[PDB]
Design a binder for this molecule. Structure first.
Ligand code: NA
Length: 628
């Protein structure tokens, strides 16, 4: 394997003797050279573990390093300052000062210029992180909400131009908000130039995707593949007009990129550098679990997938240190955490906590949630969870069957209950969600619907507002970076037209992708409305989280409340949080509280609470007690 010093001498060979002398003395080269020596070993080791003695490895690597140097040289000075700032502050992601939000540019603000006008509101709310949904060119009509990319460089004309995107990012940074965008690297749309050229037989794009002559291999692979969108097609393949079959894990118009080809890694690394230089702070690594395939396996979470992500990480440490990764791995808990690491994805979605928050609202019992917070919350140094209540996607019940069995709970039976409950097919349920991808062959199913729709706000359930407060309180205080699905802060309900829209009717996820509700946002300062109650309560919790150091970091220790309806945990051995998941008053006995201070201030309600006597919580009440 080649070493950093040797490879750098070749990077400089493009310069004449005179130019070379100047480059070698430049500050940019000095920084690039230093980072190469420190991080190149990791890049080489990761690529070697995947490609081994592949003849294309060396040539691909040298091409990638040459591009990395040009990219860093071009990188704006202001971004280079952020690179240095984060190099020496790896835990910026763990600060309690961080609070994020996510929204679709078109649905929330019309276009990029409109989004820019919403920045003052984001500052009003207290956001320091903003994830904008897929912004680039995609197929007209059906594109999986922009996740079928037809071009990684051209902005969706309905949203604006690449110039408008630069202005937006600059404006976000000026307002103290980090820009977060998707890195859709597992697949492209079937209309992407690479796909068209690969399928046409262009040698330059040979083996950029997985294309087969017939069903022989597809049938073999399908013996172990999980269906993500069973409604769209069976297994993981789709047939082309000419009769061939292509690997399509998701929709048929999304073709999986072939990472067994080193040139594909180089191509996508180039796209990552492009996004990095636009000023993006965090890249959401979409579908990380699926980037490596192997016959006889589920083609999910394979070793090479992790290695490739660690290789991408090293490229950023060398050419754009400020860029961090957010892993999107909605899989088994044992597998979710394997993507999180300082050298892989520094942060990642926490689907287990999210799914269990909803589980607990339905069952009124905190058993599973307590178990998860006790054994699966703490992470390695310099990494953090992204805690959320809802997202642009459906809710999947990804808790571990093994964990549940230990509590005497049957995974399959329990998911049946949760699905029926949340789609209003269970006596007395307050939820008004909609089914997503019910699979007749497996019995699995997911749930669509906004947070407000799922807690009963559509029918004005008197407990709805308090349920929303409880859910968000936990994502905001357990430790990690909380992500608010914009619109939830004013109680936005399901979209009213998706079910009859021919481009959306077969994808219920659109039920929870409503447009900015002018009426509700105009009521956010009125305490007599649901919108005003939800907004002021969430804003208050955000204010407390960001100003109180007791919430800093991502570690927690659970507290046994001795009441199956009340969750309890402690942050920094100084903040005791209690959350009542019952619609009835619930008590934490004085006996249980004997070791606590006699009195403690509650940050939620603002009153002083006595802990040397029975503590009774009202339905869905949350308490944030300062015990130190
Ligand atoms: Na030369």
């Amino acid at each position: 394997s080649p070493n950093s010093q040797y490879l750098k001498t070749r990077i400089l060979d493009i310069y004449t003797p005179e130019q070379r002398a100047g480059i070698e003395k430049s500050e940019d080269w000095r920084q690039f050279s230093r980072r190469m020596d420190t991080h190149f070993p990791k890049l080489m080791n990761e690529l070697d573990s995947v490609y081994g003695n592949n003849e294309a490895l060396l040539p691909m690597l040298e091409m990638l390093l040459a591009q990395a140097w040009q990219s860093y040289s071009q990188r704006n000075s202001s971004l280079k300052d952020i690179d240095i700032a984060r190099e020496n502050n790896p835990d910026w992601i763990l600060s309690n000062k961080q609070v994020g939000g996510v929204c679709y540019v078109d649905l929330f603000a019309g276009d990029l210029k409109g989004l820019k006008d919403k920045i003052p509101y984001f500052q009003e709310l207290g956001l320091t992180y903003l994830h904008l949904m897929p912004l680039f060119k995609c197929p007209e009509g059906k594109s999986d909400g922009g996740y079928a990319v037809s071009s990684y460089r051209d902005v969706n004309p309905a949203l604006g131009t690449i110039g408008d995107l630069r202005e937006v990012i600059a404006a976000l940074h000026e307002a103290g908000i980090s820009a977060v965008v998707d890195f859709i690297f597992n697949h492209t749309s079937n209309e992407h130039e690479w796909a068209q050229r690969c399928a046409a037989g262009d040698p330059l794009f040979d083996n950029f995707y997985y294309i087969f002559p017939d069903r022989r291999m597809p049938d073999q692979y399908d013996r172990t593949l999980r269906e993500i969108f069973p409604d769209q097609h069976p297994g993981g393949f789709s047939q082309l007009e000419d009769g061939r079959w292509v690997w399509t894990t998701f929709n048929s118009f999304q073709w999986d990129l072939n990472y067994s080809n080193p040139w594909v890694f180089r191509a996508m690394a180039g796209e990552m550098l492009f996004l990095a230089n636009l000023g993006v702070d965090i890249l959401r690594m979409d579908a990380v679990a699926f980037i490596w395939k192997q016959m006889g396996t589920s083609c999910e979470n394979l070793p090479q997938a992790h290695a490739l992500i660690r290789a991408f990480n090293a490229v950023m440490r060398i050419a754009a240190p400020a860029v961090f990764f957010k892993s999107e791995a909605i899989v088994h808990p044992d597998q979710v955490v394997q993507y999180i690491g300082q050298d892989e994805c520094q942060i990642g979605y926490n689907p287990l906590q999210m799914a269990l928050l909803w589980n607990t609202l339905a069952t009124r019992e905190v058993n599973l949630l307590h178990q998860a917070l006790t054994y699966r919350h703490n992470l390695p140094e310099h990494t953090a969870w992204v805690n959320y209540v809802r997202s642009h996607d459906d809710i999947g019940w990804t808790f571990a069957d093994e964990d549940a069995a230990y509590l005497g709970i049957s995974g399959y039976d329990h998911r049946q209950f949760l699905n029926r409950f949340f789609v209003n097919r269970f006596d007395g349920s307050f939820a008004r969600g909609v089914p997503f991808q019910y699979n007749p062959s497996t019995g699995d199913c997911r749930v669509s619907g906004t947070a407000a729709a799922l807690v009963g706000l559509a029918q004005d359930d008197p407990h709805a507002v308090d349920r929303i407060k409880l859910l968000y309180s936990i994502a905001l205080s357990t430790g990690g970076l909380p992500l608010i699905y914009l619109g939830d802060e004013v109680g936005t309900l399901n979209d009213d037209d998706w079910s009859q829209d021919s481009n959306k009717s077969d994808d219920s996820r659109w039920a929870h992708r409503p447009r900015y509700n002018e009426a509700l946002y105009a009521q956010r300062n009125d305490p007599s409305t649901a919108a005003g109650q939800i907004y002021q309560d969430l804003r208050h919790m955000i204010a407390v989280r960001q100003s109180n150091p007791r919430f800093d970091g991502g570690r927690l220790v659970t507290f046994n409340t001795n009441n199956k309806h009340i969750i309890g945990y402690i942050r920094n051995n100084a903040l005791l949080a209690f959350g009542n998941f019952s619609e009835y008053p619930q008590t934490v006995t004085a006996h249980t509280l004997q070791a606590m201070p006699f009195k403690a201030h509650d940050l939620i309600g603002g009153k002083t609470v006595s802990l040397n006597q029975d503590l009774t919580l009202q339905p869905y009440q949350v308490m944030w007690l300062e015990i130190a």
